[PDB]
Amino acid sequence: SKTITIYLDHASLPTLNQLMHFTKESEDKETARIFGFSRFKLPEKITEQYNNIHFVEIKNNRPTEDIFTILDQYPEKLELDLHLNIAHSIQLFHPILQYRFKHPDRISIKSLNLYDDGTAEYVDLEKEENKDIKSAIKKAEKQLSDYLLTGKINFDNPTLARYVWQSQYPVKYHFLSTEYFEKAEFLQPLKTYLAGKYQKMDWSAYEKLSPEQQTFYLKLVGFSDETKQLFHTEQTKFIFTGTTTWEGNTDIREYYAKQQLNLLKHFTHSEGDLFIGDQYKIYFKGHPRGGDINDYILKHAKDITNIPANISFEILMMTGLLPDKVGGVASSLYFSLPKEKISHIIFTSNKKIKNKEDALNDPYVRVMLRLGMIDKSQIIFWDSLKQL
Ligand SMILES: Nc1ccn([C@@H]2O[C@H](COP(=O)(O)O)[C@@H](O)[C@H]2O)c(=O)n1
C-alpha cells in the first residue's frame, strides 16, 4: 500500500488537533496527505516541502469531487486513515464511500480518528436525554451497515449515529468533554459502548512533542514571537473572547457586533454589570470566523490588546500563556479553562429569553450546567444587558 492520511476539517477545534497529529509525522515528507482547508492556510515554506500533499474544499459538509481527482492520482493499493469531525462525520464520509464503490478492492479504510467540531455535539446530545439510547445504538449500527452498502444516508437518530463507527472500522474519538459522558446519566449505555475508544482533547499532547516539533506546530497554527510578546507584561490579564454567527444577513451580523461591543463594556467599565476591576490589562480574542464582527470591536474598543483572531485560543493554554481571567460569549474555548480563570460566560438565543425557566431550556445552558461550568443563579443572555 500507500497510506493516504485524510484530514477533512477546517474548523478551529478539530483542525488544531489534526495539525498536531500531522506535526508528529512531519519528518516524513513523502506520505500522502489531504487537508480539507485552503492551501494558503499554512505557510507555503512548510507545505512546499511535502511532495504528496493536497488541499480540498469542504462544501455543505462534504469534500468536493476534487477528492476523487486527487485519489485518482494514486494508482497503487491505498489504505485511508481518515480524520474527521464527529458532528458531520456521516456527510464527510459520503464521497469517500462513493469513491470506494469504484475501487473497492484497491482502496480500504484503515482507521477513523473522530474529533468534536465544537459544542454542537454536546448541544445535540442534550436533546436526546429522554430517548432509549441502548436501542438507538442498535438501530444506528444497522443503519450504518446499510449506508456502507447503499451509499444512502438514512438514520432515525442522526445524533447517536455519530457514535457507532466502531461497528465497521477501527476508530478513536477525541472529545472536548470526556466529563460530559461521565456526568450525563442518560448516556451510560453509550459510555459503556464506547469504553476504551475515546480520549479527551487534552492539549498536553503538545508536551509529548519534541522541541523542534513544537516550533513547527506553532508555525502551522500561526503563533509567532510577536504573539508571545503581547503577554510580556507582568500585569494581570483579562481576555475578552468574541463569538460569531453563520449568517450573512447584515442586520443579524451588525446585531452581533453591537451586542458584543456592549458586552465588552460591561466587563471593562466600572459602570458595567460584570466589571472585572482596574487591575487587569484587557485583551481581545476574536472568533476565527468572526469577520466583520471582529473589525467592529477593533474599530471601537479603547485600551485593548488584540490577539489575532485566527490564533485558536487553546494555543494559549499549550504554550503556558493563559491569562488570569477570561470572559465573553459561550464558546468551546471555555471547556479548556480551569474554573478560577472564568469571569463570566454569556449566552445568546434566537428566542427572546425572558426569565430563568426560559434560560434552563437552552441546550447550551444545559450543557454548561450539566458540567457545572456555570450555576443557575448567574445565567446571563446578552440582550438582557443594558446599552452602556
Ligand atoms: N473567541 C474565540 C472563539 C473561538 N475560538 C476557537 O474556535 C473554537 C470553536 O469555538 P466556538 O464554539 O466559539 O465556535 C474554539 O475551541 C477555539 O479554538 C477562538 O480561538 N477564539
Side-chain angles (χ1 to χ4, degrees):
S1 88
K2 281 176 184 181
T3 300
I4 316 300
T5 300
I6 301 182
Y7 299 107
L8 288 177
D9 276 283
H10 59 275
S12 175
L13 193 66
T15 294
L16 206 52
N17 284 274
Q18 286 169 17
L19 289 178
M20 202 152 39
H21 183 272
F22 171 60
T23 291
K24 295 196 199 233
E25 261 96 40
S26 53
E27 290 180 38
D28 175 6
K29 259 53 164 203
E30 297 308 312
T31 297
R33 281 78 160 200
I34 298 181
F35 290 96
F37 50 68
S38 190
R39 68 171 292 109
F40 298 107
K41 174 185 174 71
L42 304 176
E44 278 158 312
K45 275 177 172 282
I46 281 163
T47 57
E48 97 73 53
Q49 300 181 35
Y50 294 81
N51 305 312
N52 295 108
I53 186 159
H54 315 265
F55 305 88
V56 73
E57 188 186 16
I58 300 310
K59 166 176 204 64
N60 302 308
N61 299 299
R62 296 187 181 184
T64 65
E65 292 189 354
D66 252 351
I67 202 167
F68 308 150
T69 318
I70 288 165
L71 288 174
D72 284 341
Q73 296 166 33
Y74 294 97
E76 314 84 347
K77 212 170 193 181
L78 309 181
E79 295 194 339
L80 311 187
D81 286 319
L82 305 187
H83 292 249
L84 64 189
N85 75 80
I86 294 167
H88 302 288
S89 56
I90 292 303
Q91 291 288 341
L92 290 167
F93 192 86
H94 186 278
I96 307 297
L97 187 45
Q98 289 292 323
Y99 189 78
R100 269 202 27 91
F101 292 160
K102 295 190 183 191
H103 314 275
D105 293 318
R106 192 163 60 83
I107 304 293
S108 67
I109 305 311
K110 183 161 142 158
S111 67
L112 306 185
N113 276 90
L114 294 160
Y115 309 73
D116 281 325
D117 192 75
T119 53
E121 284 86 346
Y122 298 87
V123 298
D124 286 346
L125 282 166
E126 279 296 322
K127 310 196 203 105
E128 301 305 316
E129 181 162 33
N130 286 133
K131 295 218 172 40
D132 175 347
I133 299 300
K134 209 174 181 210
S135 65
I137 287 160
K138 304 323 195 150
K139 178 56 144 196
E141 285 180 323
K142 161 217 152 40
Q143 292 187 309
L144 185 58
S145 195
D146 292 353
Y147 175 44
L148 295 193
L149 189 60
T150 71
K152 112 191 124 204
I153 291 178
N154 181 45
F155 297 86
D156 291 4
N157 195 318
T159 296
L160 272 153
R162 292 159 178 182
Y163 302 92
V164 301
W165 292 103
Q166 68 197 53
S167 71
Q168 295 286 351
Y169 305 112
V171 69
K172 251 199 276 295
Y173 293 87
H174 305 254
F175 290 153
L176 178 65
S177 175
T178 51
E179 281 189 6
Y180 187 86
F181 290 89
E182 293 149 16
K183 297 196 176 101
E185 183 59 27
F186 79 100
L187 284 176
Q188 287 315 275
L190 185 57
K191 176 208 208 335
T192 301
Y193 173 72
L194 292 178
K197 312 286 240 204
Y198 69 86
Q199 64 205 82
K200 203 175 177 198
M201 285 181 174
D202 235 352
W203 316 128
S204 173
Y206 178 86
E207 306 306 343
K208 282 186 142 78
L209 289 186
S210 86
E212 176 182 11
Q213 274 173 336
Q214 290 171 2
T215 306
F216 182 86
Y217 178 77
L218 304 165
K219 262 173 267 205
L220 296 179
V221 303
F223 182 90
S224 62
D225 285 322
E226 290 97 286
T227 308
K228 185 193 220 314
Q229 279 328 285
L230 299 162
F231 299 90
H232 190 243
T233 185
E234 316 172 325
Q235 178 157 23
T236 51
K237 311 171 169 61
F238 169 78
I239 297 173
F240 181 67
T241 65
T243 190
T244 197
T245 173
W246 312 137
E247 199 86 52
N249 184 294
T250 314
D251 293 5
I252 305 181
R253 298 195 72 81
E254 257 155 56
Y255 178 66
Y256 270 63
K258 285 172 176 154
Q259 283 316 102
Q260 184 162 281
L261 184 58
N262 191 55
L263 180 63
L264 164 67
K265 294 201 194 88
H266 281 276
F267 281 108
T268 59
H269 292 23
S270 61
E271 328 76 53
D273 291 353
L274 313 169
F275 179 54
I276 58 184
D278 287 339
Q279 76 160 298
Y280 297 107
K281 180 179 178 48
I282 313 306
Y283 298 74
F284 182 51
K285 178 59 263 281
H287 192 290
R289 305 176 263 300
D292 34 48
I293 302 166
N294 295 338
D295 307 325
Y296 196 89
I297 300 304
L298 291 168
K299 276 166 150 269
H300 294 96
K302 333 281 212 164
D303 217 329
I304 198 157
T305 299
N306 189 62
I307 300 156
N310 63 288
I311 299 172
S312 298
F313 179 100
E314 297 83 0
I315 298 156
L316 300 179
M317 189 194 78
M318 301 183 207
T319 60
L321 293 54
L322 290 168
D324 304 281
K325 299 280 173 183
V326 186
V329 180
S331 171
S332 304
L333 73 89
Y334 286 95
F335 290 67
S336 81
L337 283 177
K339 164 229 276 296
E340 75 288 342
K341 288 190 189 295
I342 294 158
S343 190
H344 220 116
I345 291 162
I346 309 298
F347 294 92
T348 70
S349 169
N350 288 321
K351 297 169 185 201
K352 163 72 174 221
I353 296 291
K354 312 183 302 311
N355 49 62
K356 193 158 96 184
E357 77 184 10
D358 280 345
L360 297 188
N361 294 327
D362 181 84
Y364 208 159
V365 170
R366 292 165 41 95
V367 171
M368 294 214 179
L369 286 169
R370 206 175 292 269
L371 294 172
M373 298 163 61
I374 58 179
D375 86 280
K376 299 189 309 196
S377 62
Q378 60 128 106
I379 299 169
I380 295 171
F381 288 80
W382 68 356
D383 58 322
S384 79
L385 296 166
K386 72 152 162 181
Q387 298 305 309
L388 217 46

